Each structure stands twice: as structure tokens, then as C-alpha cells.
Amino acid sequence: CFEPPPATTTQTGFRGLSMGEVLHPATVKAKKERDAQYPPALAAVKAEGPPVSQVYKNVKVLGNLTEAEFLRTMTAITEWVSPQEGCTYCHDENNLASEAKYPYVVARRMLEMTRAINTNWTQHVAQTGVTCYTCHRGTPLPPYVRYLEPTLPLNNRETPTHVERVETRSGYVVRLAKYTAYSALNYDPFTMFLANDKRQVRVVPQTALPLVGVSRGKERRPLSDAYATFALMMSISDSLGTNCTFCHNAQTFESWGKKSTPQRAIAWWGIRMVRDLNMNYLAPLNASLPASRLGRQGEAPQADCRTCHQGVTKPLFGASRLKDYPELGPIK
């Protein structure tokens, strides 16, 4: 029923405002241990020699690497994504230039995606950055992905119960609930807010009085939007292992300046990054994946905050391999 004390608490606002983190040490410990499994950087190799655009046949993204550097990247990718199957997860064992296995073409695109995150989305990932591991954690299917309807368990390495399965209609409300930190909010914030850029998260007026022409009848947004935004925030909070005060002074959720933390601005960039990943890199992979990887509407699995963060405010507690793998970005 309960979590025994002591609680670890931080301060994220002016004294007397009850703003900050509230953490269970055993939980933090467990997540640190899981995340500590991040394989170390591979040893540095020879700088020096022909580029693989010359040496190999079908290199389209990493062509400027030396052979040693390139094969180092292939070793790293294998550890991070398909360590149990090895190189032949993506490659034809008798022809390494062949693109015949679907993971190969997906991986090329993921190389482009990863370089784009570390190059174009530094407003979010800073100099920490991401590798294949950040999401995949050693398996071809990342453990925390989203479809265009809620799915359970959140971690797809866990066996579902009958009621958790997406086909069992009686379990829908719980699938929704377990995506919004157990709330009864009747909204899927993934498809609403993170799959694409169609909706506005903000719902609160920035004036005291109602502006004429936007405040009556069909001029107005429905109150549902406010519930849906709350659902997104419950999800974001749970996805990062945190609460509203990490980012907001609840006095005024809609205000920036002294009323929001620096982390709130990083979160904002995070939403933008996720929409780009989903719209431009992940969703289009439905044409490359086997039917067995797709959801019930033919969608490829897509990313949310949890895909990388997995219950922690910085993914992997801020572990980085950025300087170890320059070929994953930032690209000059």
C-alpha cells in the first residue's frame, strides 16, 4: 500500500512554495542499476586511411568514416540493438552490401534519425545526446513505444494479460489510465499531442478578461482540450519520474519567466523533437516493416518521452557517448 520513509526531496521554487522532487530511494536505485547496463564506449581506433565510401559498396550515411571507424560503429550498433542475434540481424551473412533484410533499411534511417537528434535537436538533448541504446536498450524492438491506441504493458518485454491486450475491449479504460499516471482522464495524449503537430497543448487564456470573438459558442475550444492537456501532463510527469513542480509553479501553469523552471523549456523542445521524430522518421517506416510490427491501423511503433526517459528526468541519468561516437552527431 505504502512506500517507507525516508523520502528524498528537492527544491525547485522559492522557499515556502512546496515545489520540487519527491523521490523513493529504492526506486531511484533500481533505475540507476538498470540504466548502468549502458555498455561502455568501444576503444578508439585508427583515424587515418581511405573513407568507406571508397572501401565498401553500399554506405550512404557513414561514408566519411575510415574502415576501422566504420566497423567500430557496426560493433557499437550491434551491442546496442541486436546483441543476441549479432551482425546478421540486419545483414545477409554472405553479402554485407545487401539490403534484403528489413532491419538494414530501417537501421540506415535510424542512423539518419540519430544524427538529426544530436545535430538539429540540441535544444533538447544538449551535449548529452542519444545513441541507439537510449531507446533500444539492447533489443531490436525498443521496450517503450506507442501505437495509435493505448497498449499495455507499457514495457513490451512484459507479458500482457488477456485484459491488457488491445483486442480485449473491456480493458480500454485501464490502458488509457496506465498511460496517464492512473487517472480516469478519457484522452490518449500520445495520438492527440505527440504523433503530430496538429493540436495545441496550451489551453489557458493569457488575458484576465474573455476576448470578444473567441469566447462564445463555437468560437470556443471545447473544455475537453483542458482535460486532454492535463492527460498529457500526467503522462509526461510519469514518463520522467517526476511531478508538475519540476517544471511549473502551479500558481500559474500558463506563465513562463519566474513561474517556470529551465526544465520546462527543455520539455517544450522535447515535444517538438518527438513530433519531428514521429512525423518524419518513425511513422513513415510502416512501409518498411513487416505486418507483424505494425499496430491495428497499420502504424509503425512511434516514440514518446518514455521511449528515451524511461522514468527518469534525464535518460540514463545523463550518461553520454557523444564524444565517443562523433558519427552519430552533431554533424558539421
Residues making up the binding site = 74, 87, 90-91, 110, 124, 132, 135-136, 233, 244, 247-248, 305, 308-309
C-beta separation of 106 from 91 below 8 A:
no
- Residue numbers 220-279 binding other proteins by CB under 8 A: 220-224, 226-227, 229-230, 234, 237-238, 243-245, 248-258, 260-262, 264-265, 268-269, 272
Cell reading at 116: 538529426
- Residue numbers 245-274 binding ligand HEC by CB under 6 A: 246-248, 253-254, 263-264, 266-268, 270-271, 274
Note the helical H segments in 102-206: 102-120, 122-125, 132-136, 172-177, 189
Q: How far apart are CA 184 and CA 38, in angstroms?
A: 36
- CB of 175 or CB of 243, closer to ligand HEC: 243
Applying CB under 6 A, which of residues 82, 151, 249, 310 lies at the interface with ligand HEC?
82
Shortest distance (Å) from residue 163 CB to ligand HEC: 24
Query: Within 13 Å, how many C-alpha atoms sit on residue 161's CB side?
Result: 8
Shortest distance (Å) from residue 172 CB to ligand HEC: 22
Applying CB under 8 A, which of residues 57, 60, 218, 332 lies at the interface with other proteins?
218
Sign of CA dihedral 118, 112, 283, 80: negative
Shortest distance (Å) from residue 319 CB to ligand HEC: 9
Shortest distance (Å) from residue 140 CB to ligand HEC: 4
Annotated binding site for heme: 74, 87, 90-91, 110, 124, 132, 135-136, 233, 244, 247-248, 305, 308-309
Question: Which one-letter amino acid corresponds to residue 214?
Answer: V
Applying CB under 6 A, which of residues 28, 42, 166, 201 lies at the interface with ligand HEC?
201
- Residue numbers 4-43 binding other proteins by CB under 8 A: 4-7, 9-20, 22-24, 27
DSSP-assigned beta bridge partners for residue 66? 51
Shortest distance (Å) from residue 197 CB to ligand HEC: 10
Per-position DSSP letters for 274-295, written without gaps between them: HHHIIIIIIGGGGGTS-GGGS-
Per-position DSSP letters for 43-72, written without gaps between them: PP----S-BHHHHSSS-SSSTTSBHHHHHH
Q: How far apart are CA 290 and CA 102, in angstroms?
A: 8
Cell reading at 214: 473567441
User: Would you give the binding string for ligand HEC spanning residues 24-63, x where CB under 6 A is met?
Assistant: --------------------------------xxxxxxx-
